[model samples]
Target chain A: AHARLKTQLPQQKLQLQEACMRKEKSVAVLEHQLVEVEETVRQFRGAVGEQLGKMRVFLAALEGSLDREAERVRGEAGVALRRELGSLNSYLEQLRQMEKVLEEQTEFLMKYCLVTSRLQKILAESPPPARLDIQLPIISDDFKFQVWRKMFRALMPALEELTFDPSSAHPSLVVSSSGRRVECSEQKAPPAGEDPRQFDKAVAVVAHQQLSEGEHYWEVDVGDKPRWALGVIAAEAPRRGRLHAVPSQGLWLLGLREGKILEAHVEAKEPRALRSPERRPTRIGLYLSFGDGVLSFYDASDADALVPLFAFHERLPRPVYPFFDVCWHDKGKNAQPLLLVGP
Target chain B: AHARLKTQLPQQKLQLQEACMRKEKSVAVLEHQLVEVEETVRQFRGAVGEQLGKMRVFLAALEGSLDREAERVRGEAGVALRRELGSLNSYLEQLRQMEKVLEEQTEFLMKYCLVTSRLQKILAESPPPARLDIQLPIISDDFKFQVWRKMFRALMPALEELTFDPSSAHPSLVVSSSGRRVECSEQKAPPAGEDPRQFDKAVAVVAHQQLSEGEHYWEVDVGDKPRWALGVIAAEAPRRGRLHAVPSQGLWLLGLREGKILEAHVEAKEPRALRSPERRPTRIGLYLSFGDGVLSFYDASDADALVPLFAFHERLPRPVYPFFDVCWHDKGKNAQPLLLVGP
Candidate 1:
């Protein structure tokens, strides 16, 4: 019995040993499989990284090319636009020149018609008396009067403040002395019921004096109206001056009334007296009178710078003596013209 | 002995078992170390690849930037060069203008001197005649000569040729001829040993023709020699035969031989003819002749266009008459005198 048991124990031991060896072999095979799978995952991760890097580099190159193309296109467009604009500007200038020529031609025609009409009217009025000893004003003085008349006449159409307000009509010309008003009866309005003064009532005389040789500026505003008067004079007179009549660098005359400027004139003086103590002559005198809405100017010798001595505002109410005061400055010296009633 | 040998074998078996276990442990350590080394090598390779890729991308970026900057620099340089060239061109123009002005002034002064000297010489030599008589050749015979003389005299300093060659003295007069060997002269050469038969000798003459009422052309050539004479005649002769001088134009003599132009004048006709062709008048005649190598022209009737002429060339050479002929295209119409000549 002991012999049989020993033999059976040996067989049992051998079977257990075989089972353990099989299990060991299976574990080794599983470990080997796991290592292979890990290697494959690493390879996949590296490939993904390389692909991402390549994509980034490609994107950068595309961006750089796009930027360069954009810059090139913009530069070319700017050049084309500039050339087109230059051509258009030149064409516009030519049109402007043509328009100016047309305007000048039309103005010349209009002036010719006006002169012809005036001549015809004078002829129709009949010849003056042949033997009459009537002395006539000098042509130059008459011209001055005509110029003053025209200047004042231009102001009439723009007298909005005087004609529109009836209450504004103050008939009697008042002179201010020590704050006291002196009314002139002769220049006063006709007795309130029958008729008002039909003609201009007040006159103001303004004179300029040379304190020193320099520029002088003055402005006049018509109350509640766009009408204003400006006068500038440069003294180069010992001899009769040559008139430049240019817009810049000359004696400028502006007449503004109502809400707009009506007329402007520029009279230039020739430069003279290069080595004289007084390079410029004396002062220029300016006068603006508002009663009857008239503006005038005179030189130091009391010569009128305008024509038609007085201007009539046809639209204004009778007896509307609009008071006007003119102030001026020369070399920082200020003065106001004295207002007076018409003789 | 067999028992002792069995005891030793068992001990050797135990020793063998221990040695195998140690060997297996050593193999496992070596495998682990190998695995760590492989992991390190993989990481190092990944870092190196990434760095290389980054370097490539950076190099690309730098290259693109460099190209852009280089392009920008080239563009700027181009603009700068253009601006510099434009400025240089403008400066050159200004310099040319200055040089021209200086040359003109110098020429004017020099011409003035020569003309004054010539005038003095003429006044000293010629006695005032009580009545001067000038005979002019018929227009049909000398029209070309007269025309060329007038054009040359009028345009004293300028020369014309088919092509401009600065090295050649500008021909004060250009004569057109289809045939070979037209009379030509060196405009600037002194008149010495000049044979009248020479094919290259040029003659100056004034051409007269009538295009319409009040429109006339006086053509002449004043050689590079400082002296020139000009003549003008009426374009239209009323009544087909009456000779008349141009109304307001006067003969202008120029001395251009000395690199400057000096102006001289002859008598001018006043109150030119107003008669039309219906008025009865004498037949008109034109004439050209040479005296002392200086050419002259006159009218048959009054010869007023030939008066008070100034003579200029010090060494006047007799002009060679070319074979070329002057013809008119009026068909059957009378050909007007087209040339004037005077000494």
Candidate 2:
């Protein structure tokens, strides 16, 4: 049995040896392939990696430049313009004022100076010397005109050429032929027919203009009425049913009671009073709070008395309309017409 | 044992082994070589594979580094740069306008801030019922350019070159050119000309232009000066000897000190404070009341309002010679040139 085992074990040993030799042969081929792969990877790491490194460096450089440029711009306009705001305001104002006087009178000084430049040519050229008869520098009609003109120009952008909505007028109110004026009348037939927008309980009217997104301005002559109000109402508000007439009820108004301007919003029983009239504002101005968020009133009636009364804020999305209301005033003393002065 | 295995092995295997033994060498030697070959092959494969793998990892790492770096850099610059290029400028301009309105809120805030810087500076906001007797906002220079520019198209008066009178200037004042510029410097003055009519005590300088006429008007650029006096001084009146600035004292002057407009009249000790201005007037106009015995000042700082400041009634027989006195403060906080405007 021992002799048989020895012979069988050697035969199996040879088989194992043959299998190992085949594996070694395959390993040799694999080793050669691994060398080639290694070489390729090394080359790629050197050339492409170097290329990618440069890309990284370039990106780093670019990032720095762009970062610095943004900062530089921030410094330039950010810091400088911030400070220059004051100077620019002053400068713009100054140049504008200087241009004003430069326009009017030079003949007063031209009277004393060397015949002046353009005048010399014209004096020789003209048959009769077309000259200016400027007196001393005083506040002439030119000055007054300057004041009014400036006021108008500044206010023009916000102003609306209002056309009064007679349908919004009360039964006792009389609207003008041009739809610009309204007053309480005893004999005049009421505003043609009743509508949801009609203010039968109050002697008020609305404007025929839309004030939604931006700003608007309107002027009205509140002559000698003991009670007068200018306000804005929501386009989507309850127009009838006793009209709650307040910010809480979608109305923002500035009412004139006695001498002070009453802010009659949210509540009429206890409205806050703003500044008193230094003079009876003949042409009271109503301006929308630029963003359609607030209402502002200005006393632009008299030429000399141009000022702001009070600002009224509205919480409701009150799409604008002309509100000519004598909120709570003397029905008898309010005889004068609240003429809508549109320029 | 080998001799006994003859029965277990096939004759072919025996022949093949015997042939290998005859051709090569001893079995022990061949076995030793086989063990060394296995060791060498295994070591070679490990080294090759490790090298290739390391190269690939390095390449991947390089890519990651580049991508990450650029993303970070681009994020910083790209985002901010785009913002810098965008609406900040427009936002700043709008913000500037908002400040312009912030000033008006002061008036509404019980005259706390920005309520006409002049009144607070002068009246200290005395709360003395001076809620501003607001007069008509007169004229804007824009209006002049719009309305009167064409009407007064022929009103460009000629420039009159008026020379400076060094003799009329006080020793303390510095005058240069032909009454064009004046400085408030106490240095070695070259303008100490020999003349008996020289003003030796007061800090004043008079122009060579003649006075005693029918409503003469002139402008002086005061720049940003804090203290300056500009008005007409009677030649017959006192020129020296600690004189009074009153029209009764023959010195009808408008002086600005500490931001307050000063009127020189019968009361020379304390000049009356007139209406305060929101801005310090750089270019001012002195208008003779012609036959009214009033000297009014117009703020010609800009062409805008040319607003009439205050018409002071001083019973002086007003004349031409524009006398300007400057009191230099901080020496360097002020470097303004009081240049007399064109005739």
Candidate 3:
């Protein structure tokens, strides 16, 4: 029994030992598996880190390139915009210059039209001369009245003198004369018994002695007044006689003898009265009695009125005087004056 | 031996049992510890999962807000840019209007200055009236020579003929007596045959005339080439005679002895020549002879040139008669020529 027990015990002991060995082997295998799993996880983590680093570097490079592209695009756009703005500025400048030229041309055309119209009217109203006799009847009995009649006859010696130098004296006479003198002066009456509002009126007749043919000049002072009324009668030797009247008060000429009324105008509310009657020679050919300070003119022949040639204010006194005076001298010897009046 | 065996076996058995119990206790404690560790690990894993979920939600919310803010900023920037653009447009419009008004004012001032300057120069050269003679002389004997003189004298009969009327033939010469008539046509000729040109050149002695006299008108016809001079001679009565030249040539007027020449000019040029000297007037008041077709006027007192009052291109069929007529109806008289020249 003892031998058998010993043998069994030994067997059991050996078996136990074998079992422990197997358990140890199993533990070692589990440890090995855990270690392998950890190594795999470490490898996975390393690969992920390397891949992320590469992605970061690639992203930075892309951002830098995008910045450069954006900057380049911005610079190009700025230059294009600047060029467009400069072109717009130059186009606006041209429009300003064109507007100025248009204004000057319009003013010149208006002035040319006014001057042309005035010249045409002056030529239309003038008439040629015809023969007629002027008569005067004695109205007063005083010596002064006789003196006045004599003075009138003496005033026009050329009209009274026949054969160039006639010797004659009559209360009334028909005389033929060529050139006659006319003068004008400013007259002012002293504040005496004379009526302040009353105006002086007179008439005189003179005949030409010599039958000289030519243009003559005569002038009269027209006192400044808003309105004036005047009348004239004239006769040319051998047949023609005419009566003329002024339309408005001012200056006028009675060169024609068809018994028609003519008028001239001046634009003064009140004019300075003449202290004395003034006389001046008329323009020989188509005489114009241009009045300064006030606007007035007259046609020598036909006893017609000439419209104001210029505004009194705008005219230069000396140049206007010269302009009218020079035109008279250019006429040949046949040009003559007949009568002129102003009020 | 048996006893020892029994004691050792019990003790061994007890010890074995103790060891077994201890091992079991150790196993149980380790299990408990493992269970606690497992529970802790589970809690940690759950917390980590919850935190990661919260981070993801936070990141998504931040990204959405950032996008909204960027959109808002972009909209605000667009609004600000539009406002700046609108302000710039308003500023440009105001500048254009101001520039146009300034340019127009500058142009107006320039034109005004030019017109005023020309007027001032014309006023300085004119002659005064105090230097002219009341009576003008008639000296020229050339048939055509005295045309201008006669015409000028005829213009103002009252002024020119202060003392006498030669047209009517008179025997007795008294201030009040009626004079006898004489025929001028039958009068004898002067001793010397008058050289028309030379006779026209002779100066006449004019008598003193009154200042209150009116105006006269006259005309004369010189042969087409008749050279005549006319003007007002200013003289200190019977003293030195001075002439005030008219600016224009041809027709002109002499004021009452004042050196000033008034309203004188030439209207036409003389034609080729004259046919008959016999047809010409023997005397003219304002006429003085010169070169062919050249009519000059002299302020006889000053010897200054006066513009010719009128010129004729050719001869007229009728006598070149000057109209010597006056309207003494008013202070302002009518004594101007009808025509400057005749053909």
Candidate 4:
């Protein structure tokens, strides 16, 4: 019994040692991950820092261009005006010369006649100077808008204005009068129709604006809503009946379920749970690049620093519209409306 | 004959006195005109002087606006980027803390198990910090055109491209391929068949653009040509044989003739001779204000200083087209083409 006990104890201790070895190995992996994350932070700092510097440099160049333009225009206008002024001064001198000739003319009839005719010839020869005005660019009232318009081109994805299409909305969903806000409610409104354009089963609505040609960005305010979905749907995507949110069905979405589970609708697969940020995002940002065939979701609780959530890449042959899905309001706990924010 | 001369001497003296008195009265009129022109010169200086100052003020205001916008945008981007940087720093702090925990764990199996799991949990909880970029307004490449487009509004009469209508050009005149130049030639090109729009007798051509709404300006470079005519003609103006260059005939013009005489077509009167400038203007500028029903001519020999030639004020019920009448080439002596200069 003692020999068996000793053997068991040694075997158990060996087992413990093996477990510890495995544990240490995993810990090493964790340490490696920590180091990787730290490196990521460092790289992020360096990369973003470089980008900020570029911003300043770009702005500085813009300023220089503006200053140079102003200087050139001012110089052109000044030279022209000064030339006109010089002419006027010279004309004044000619007039003074005429004054002298008039004073010198004697009372004799012949002399008076000669002087008068000469002076008249001079007067007839000299044409009056045209009134010149320095025409500067009109930049006073709408300066900000004008400047923004010029600068807008460099922005990879420009902010877009999206409004809910009431005609296509589900009966259980209520669309705001301004067309920007959408909410799900128990009090179902009468269905305008069971038209294929309408969302028959899913509590979803399509935005009025179509995005096909270029990159676009927009934000939806989910607020404290426990369950909601926000994304984009291709123009030809199925609208009526229960629609699965997936890229294969022409839908790309980020959804929050039951106040805890967050998921992304992926291609050729079921909705996958995504790693949520430390805090629940009140606003979700959608960035779609049609040419690049990429759609990325972001946690846009902070206006400046957007936290990336998920991305999908798919070939989109047709235009896509912004889509919103406010899941069933569970006994009023999830009644928050999704609001479209503008730039 | 001697006795008759002695008897007529007093009568001759009386005739001389009458003639001298009449001459003095005309001289007085001439003096008054000279004085009036002098006063006109003074007023021109004051008014244009004031306008130039206003130009300076306008430019200063625009500069201030540009400065303010740059400052505001810089401030906004700076704050946002700085906030992102701060988050990255805090994340680095969290990572360091994790590192410390890993180091403190002992080599014991129990301790190793507990520490590894805790560290794994921390790794799972921590989200990678999002990378941020400073988005700036792009104003680098096309700044000049953008600025000019904005400033173009205040220039009352902007320079225009008065391209000649080749189809409407007279057979005897040569229209440059670029449509900007026209010259009369004895070598008649072909009638293009006496179309109603064709100038059968007059060596003239109409411009492609119709000035119907706003003020428009254009220049015609005669370049030492002793004979030519420039002005605007109503769209419905007669274009066939012996078209009179008169306002009543739907034409307004400034013409030079006989290598000396300068004349302006007058309303309800014949072409009246005008006071010519000392030197013949090589470049003639035409300013037409459609709303005001006014057309003014200038000697634009110098680009900066335009010398006023003549002005016509008449109600224009129809859109007017820029017209050029480069008179007969005079056997190669006056063959210089009228060139339209661009802004």
Candidate 5:
């Protein structure tokens, strides 16, 4: 038994050694990939800091200017109004003399004609145009809206007008007439004929617009929809088989699960769960840069600024289309449609 | 000569003494009037400071929020990104250990089957999703515009729509077809018929809209017009006689003379001269509160806020019409026209 075990154990050891060598090569590749990921993260952190810094600088200027403008306006208006007040006082002095003379004894009655004439002039003269109504500069009635509009200039990447592709929509999904909104139905339509472009199992839809290069931005009004998925799908992404939204399968997506868990569909076995945001996003602003290989999602509930939810940076496939997944309607709980926003 | 002079001198002395007493009383009245004017000035200054104080408080809060929001965004994004990086790094370590085992030697070849099976799973596994594109909140693309919009909410008094009253227009002043714009023509039109509401001398026009009570605001596009006048005229103001744009004549006007001097037509003898504004006012905003007896003029060149040019505070006459004076065209130099702006 010992002689047999020695022979078999030696062969098994040899096999294990060879297997280990293959894993060694794969490990090196993974190490390289990990390094790249680390570098990307470092760069991203820097970029975020830089963007925030810019906002801080802009806010500082806005605050400083508002103060300066208020003071300047106050000074200018004050000078003009006060000077008029001074002149009015001087005029009052002249009027006082006329009134005093009119009260003098009957002896002055003989010279009353001159005093009355002068009094007529004084009375007819427009009393010093008195008014001190100041309109402060830099602040307005719709302060929030105004400030947001000013900040918008720097952020506009030309929001893309995306429409749902009827051909690629799942049988359970309903696309709006305007081609800008999509929702899920409880009952799936009977397949009259096989359409390869249609999503067979996943309740999803693709946009008519495709991105090959350059930057693109668009907003989706998710409103109170409990469960949904949004992002981009590569041209090669599956539409027939079990539609698993994973990067390895050519789909990049962020999905809401059970209306509570936020998941980044990076893996089929275990999607990456993200922390629930402080504010629930009613409107989501999506931005993509094909050249830079970046995709970002923002909480656009506030018109003043876009708050980031999460972002993705990777070597994306060429010709990716905007994608949406209206997960189960859950008996009308999530029947609300996903809408494409316009400028 | 002494006796004759004495007879006249005694009477003159009594008159002089009485006159001196009258003058003394007049001086006392003047002093009281001066005190009132000073009090008004003090109140105005306090009011201005109060308004400015409110603005400063608002700005401080805004600035603080911006700073806090930026840091929060940075921190949130950083934690998510760094955690992902750490996970990737951990995954790499596992790969490192696997590779180390693979190099153990031919003796481990017998264990290759198990090792290769695990390798298949590892190789087929999806990589972690990597993306980091952040969108900062608050400060936007149109920074200036947004800030201005945010400031607008505090200042919105409904803007009044005013149109030119063709019946009140001077022959030399031509009202636009829309009754919004009025310009001076070098050649005066012949009076085909007499109109009591028409201005015979002053190159002016009155708006069809009249103010009786409450607060009202409107803006006029003065543009590059070299000379013009803007204000209100009381119902009793004259139209046929030599038009004097003075409060004494029931007209309150601020006029530009010689394309340089700004004059407030407060008195007939000497219109009050004002310093030229630091920034040329291409647009002017007028606000009136009849109940408060206030009228304010603002340099509305910058939409960020209204810069006050001057203001009037007094008991205003009811039913005052919006008025404009085109002034002389100066061989077309001042022919650019005054336009009533729309909301």
Candidate 6:
């Protein structure tokens, strides 16, 4: 009986082991399917990311195109709308009689007084310009006023109120609270940190308004302008300890030096003498027309009568700005804070 | 031995059947998983429709908002620009001084020769309105011509060259080959088919320019018109038999009826008789200001001053159309072709 039981145990063990092998093979196929399900889920997630990624690019491209066209249309509308306001800032541009509606009123504005009645009143008070020989059915007692007004107004439509660039101001320069005014600080390196836009080696600061397309006008109140220069520099214009306001040097401007003398400095050429008004200009007006690539200057002390300082027509290499300089000060003389005015 | 063999056979059959039952259970589990996947795929299709339906609603809302704002802005811009042009039509209601620069210019237009010079030149050719003593500072030798010209120019800025709406025109109304002109047929019924916008019971036609949220203007050239009516109607406006040219009925118009008699009819009100020019008008102007909710009409025959036959200042119900109607022919008197004049 003991021998018979031992033999049966061995046979039972072999049968169990054979059944285990068959079951293991069947379970192997189910595990393989489970692995496939994991890969499919991960790939589907990645596929969704790709499709949504493409969707964002399409929307971004469309938005960019719309913004660009809107900017241009806004500029055109602003120019067209300005003609109606009788706004005094010169920058009135060119248009013909065919499209012109109020010829007589425009004459009042374009030729002389069609501006705000207040503007006309102001023009009525100013002393007229001298170069007054132009064709007209209507002549005026103030010919130079007409010439100067026309020149100034053409520059003023695109006038922009401006602020000084803090990053560009020298460490020693003190900018006013409104950023409208700036001056030299006696204490050099007074701890306003580092900036690439800062003038590390110069006494200059830049105007925040940058010109790209269309006309731009800027004005600076001429307080104690004993030693001052007004101009715009090509944003790419190189900087130094001191740079000339020369067109050839990429600086478009008119600099007034030593009280009575006016000069034009062109790079790689002789500095030309300029015809400036005898009347001391109380305010300096700078007009820049993009297409013409010229910067013009005028005396805007008298709102009615504008004195032409000079014109700088140069080959502009790129977009520019109304660059500012806090020139070396005088001891208690002619330093009445020349402030940037861009409204 | 035979008895032992029969018992073993029965036991063996039972064991085999149990193994088959265990295998069927494993396969049943797999079938349950496959049923879940089928449900998942079908639910995905339904979910897609749900997301897309929401997307359409979002886009439709976005488009509606854009269209509404564009129409409003366009109307305001047109009104503002007209002030600058010194138009004469008199519908130049009001604006501010800083903003009003274009206002006076606009007044000269829709109101006459108040335009800038060329506008004045055109105004000078037009006659003045009979409603004198409106203002003394602004006086005109000829007011009626100023009136009509003002109305015409106000509507016809860079006048858009027009095409006819084939869907809106009646079969009897013969549209010209150029699509710019349309004339009524003597045969009463030509074979042009059905349209929702077409005048089912009237001998009328419509312009291709459908009024939207923007300001729009159009004109018609009057040839030997013994009878004709020109006006704008709500795009939803319905008509039958003979329709009166009036505002209350969603029709804003000025009609030259019975030869040279010009009159005004509005919204079921008693027709207001108007003071017309001694000269027969050659053109009619229709101006619609969507934001202001006003529709203006003028005798633009002379193309100088606009003779305001009437103006309807009412809330516009919806987008409108420039509608045309041929008055019953006046027995061979001034029976000639009238046409649409476009840019």
Q: Which candidate wins on TM-score?
A: 2
Candidate 5 Cα outliers beyond 4 Å, as residue runs: A1-156, A184-193, A303-305, B1-343
Candidate 1 stretches with Cα past 4 Å from truth are A1-247, A251-343, B1-174, B178-184, B187-203, B206-215, B218-229, B232-262, B267-343
TM-score between model 3 and native: 0.14
lDDT of 5 by residue, A262-321 (tens): 888876588888777776778887787766577888777876666566788787888888
Provide the TM-score of chain A alone for each candidate, in the order shown.
Answer: 0.22, 0.52, 0.23, 0.55, 0.59, 0.52
Question: Each candidate: fraction of true contacts kept?
Answer: 0.00, 0.01, 0.00, 0.00, 0.01, 0.00
Docking category of candidate 5: incorrect
Q: Weakest 10 consecutive residues, lDDT, candidate 5 chain B?
A: B138-147
Candidate 2, number of clashes: 27
Expressed as tens digits, the lDDT of each residue in B224-328 for candidate 2 is 786778777777776655767776666666777776554434364677676577777878877664455657777776543466766766454545466777655
Give the poorly placed runs of model 3, Cα more than 4 Å off: A10-14, A41-45, A48-52, A55-63, A86-90, A93-343, B1-343
lDDT of each: 0.30, 0.54, 0.28, 0.66, 0.69, 0.55
DockQ of 3: 0.00
**Winner on lDDT (3 vs 4):** 4
Compared with the true structure, model 4 gives a TM-score of: 0.30
Q: How many clashes (backbone N, Cα, C below 3 Å) per candidate?
A: 60, 27, 175, 2, 67, 71
Tell me the tens digit of each residue's lDDT in model 2 across A1-343.
5455445544433443443344344445444444444454445435444444433343345335544544454344434433434343443343333333233333634432232333233223322211222121233313322333333334335457788776666776667889887767757554445566676565577877777655566778887777777788778767765676677777777776765455545476777666465566667777675443557677785544456677776443746676778544354555777787655
TM-score of each: 0.15, 0.42, 0.14, 0.30, 0.35, 0.29
Question: What lDDT tens digits, residue by residue, belong to model 5 across residues B100-203?
Answer: 55545345656555555564565455354555455445332234234444454334465797889877788777788887888777785777347788887777
DockQ (Cα-based) for each candidate: 0.00, 0.01, 0.00, 0.01, 0.02, 0.00
Best model number under lDDT = 5
Off by over 4 Å in 6: A1-155, A186-194, A268-270, A331-334, B1-343
Q: Across residues A96-166, which tens digit of lDDT does each residue of candidate 4 receive?
A: 55445444512534354554565556455554434434343433322322343333233334469888888
**Candidate 5: deviation at residue B292, Å?**
36
Winner on TM-score (3 vs 4): 4
